[PDB]
């Protein structure tokens, strides 16, 4: 038997972009996911977010979902061309009474909202004047948040700034994979930088306008194992792609050692400058984790080395220890007040049987393990708050499209209908235990 904290906040986790589709009703600008997966050759079978999981339309049902399987929390985003169509200036009614609706509905049901501010789908009008790159985008991210907190913050009170802001940055504008589907390396740092002065910004407004309630941020993270006894290339992976390259500079102000030997000249030349506003204080830190690497100097000078793991259909090797590891790591690196597992989950390739059960059997396995860890770091005094799953619905998975199904409810896309899975079912008994026997 494993038993959490009392009021330890089980939840699950979606983003606009990939459940909602109806990218463009009701008055909402267009996002650089928009334009991005409408370029041909950008997203696996040119799938788009047009459609998703109609969750613009089938909200009440999906919450009500939620609700049946007992789930404390729902960590979810806010497409930021819905509610400022520009990006700034005019704000869009019909896109708050999307959200409000939403909020209301969980608050009644006695879900506690999370509410991720940025989950990726930046205005497409912003991408137009450098999006994360420029340096005014600190400014507007302050502006979109500041709506947010005067229409929402009466009633949500665990706000989110940033999703996985290395992959924003890296993952859009050094490989060119998510949008804006750029390639340089200079433009990708001043993202990284944007980024940290964006979230700093809108924390600043934050404390100004919501009074009561709670602020953080949400980093990526892998398990980096050194290939022999090499060290120093994990020492790498972890300060680059994991919360070090942030969380260094609200911490303590600079970015960690061995990205600085890696980027320095492709930061700005006064980065510096603005890094004792970086340092505003944050509430809670958000780990993603899904997935351990091998890695190897390479003449990044880093390379990945295939093991012979069990794998997900990402190709992810499952190394639950991980998450045991990047927690204590996190405690023991910055010692954060608070921090939730805010996405951990796996796709399989989910097949409805002939009795109209998902017999996921493969993803039981693998959530019961991290939660056993997570269990596990608590146990060692990890002020882990939450454990939220990566994904209520299986959902457009960005470049792989809908080729990937994280849910822990299976969604028919030709009829939308939600099947709840063997490991949602699973799931709800975790929650309504607050463990694992
Ligand atoms: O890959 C599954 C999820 N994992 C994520 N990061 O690792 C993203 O936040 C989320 O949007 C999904 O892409």
Redesign the pocket.
């Known amino acids: 038997v494993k038993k959490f904290p009392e009021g330890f906040l089980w939840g699950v986790?979606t983003?606009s972009y990939?459940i909602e589709g109806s990218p463009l009703a009701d008055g909402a600008g267009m996002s650089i996911w928009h334009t991005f997966s409408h370029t041909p050759g950008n997203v696996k079978n040119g799938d788009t977010g047009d459609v998703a999981c109609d969750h613009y339309n089938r909200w009440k049902e999906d919450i009500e979902i939620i609700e049946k399987l007992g789930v404390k929390a729902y960590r979810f985003s806010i497409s930021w061309p819905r509610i400022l169509p520009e990006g700034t200036g005019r704000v869009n009614q019909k896109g708050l009474d999307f959200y409000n609706r939403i909020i209301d509905t969980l608050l009644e049901k006695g879900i506690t909202p999370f509410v991720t501010i940025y989950?990726?789908d930046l205005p497409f009008a912003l991408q137009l004047k450098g999006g994360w790159a420029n340096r005014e985008i600190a400014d507007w991210f302050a502006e979109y948040s500041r709506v947010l907190f005067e229409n929402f913050g009466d009633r949500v009170k665990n706000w989110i700034t940033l999703?996985?802001p290395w992959?924003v940055a890296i993952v859009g504008h050094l490989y060119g994979v998510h949008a804006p589907g750029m390639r340089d390396i200079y433009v990708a740092f001043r993202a990284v930088h944007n980024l940290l002065r964006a979230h700093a910004r809108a924390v600043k407004v934050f404390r100004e306008t919501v009074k009561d309630g709670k602020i953080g941020i949400?980093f990526?993270n892998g398990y980096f194992e050194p290939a022999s006894e090499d060290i120093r290339a994990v020492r790498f992976m972890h300060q680059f792609n994991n919360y070090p390259l942030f969380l260094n500079p609200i911490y303590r102000g600079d970015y960690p050692e061995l990205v600085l030997e890696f980027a320095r000249e492709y930061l700005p030349e006064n980065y510096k400058d603005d890094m004792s506003e970086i340092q505003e204080k944050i509430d809670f830190v958000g780990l993603?984790?899904?997935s351990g690497h091998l890695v190897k100097f390479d003449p990044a000078k880093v390379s990945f080395v295939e093991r012979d793991l069990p794998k997900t259909a990402?190709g992810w090797e499952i190394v639950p220890e991980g998450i045991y590891w990047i927690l204590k790591k996190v405690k023991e690196e910055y010692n954060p007040p608070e921090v939730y597992i805010?996405?951990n989950?796996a796709?399989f390739d989910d097949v409805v049987s002939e009795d109209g059960r998902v017999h996921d059997q493969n993803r039981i396995d693998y959530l019961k393990a991290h939660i056993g860890q997570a269990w596990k770091a608590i146990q060692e005094g990890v002020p882990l708050k939450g454990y939220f799953v990566?994904?209520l619905l299986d959902?457009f998975?960005?470049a792989?499209g809908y080729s990937?199904r994280?849910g822990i409810v299976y969604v028919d896309y030709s009829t939308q209908k939600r099947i709840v899975k063997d490991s949602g079912y699973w799931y709800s008994n975790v929650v309504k235990n607050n463990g694992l026997e």
Do not use: D, I, L, P
Request: charged share 20%; net charge negative.
């Open positions: 986790a983003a990939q989950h990726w999703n996985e992959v949400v990526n993603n984790y899904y990402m805010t996405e989950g796709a990566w994904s959902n998975e960005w792989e990937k994280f």
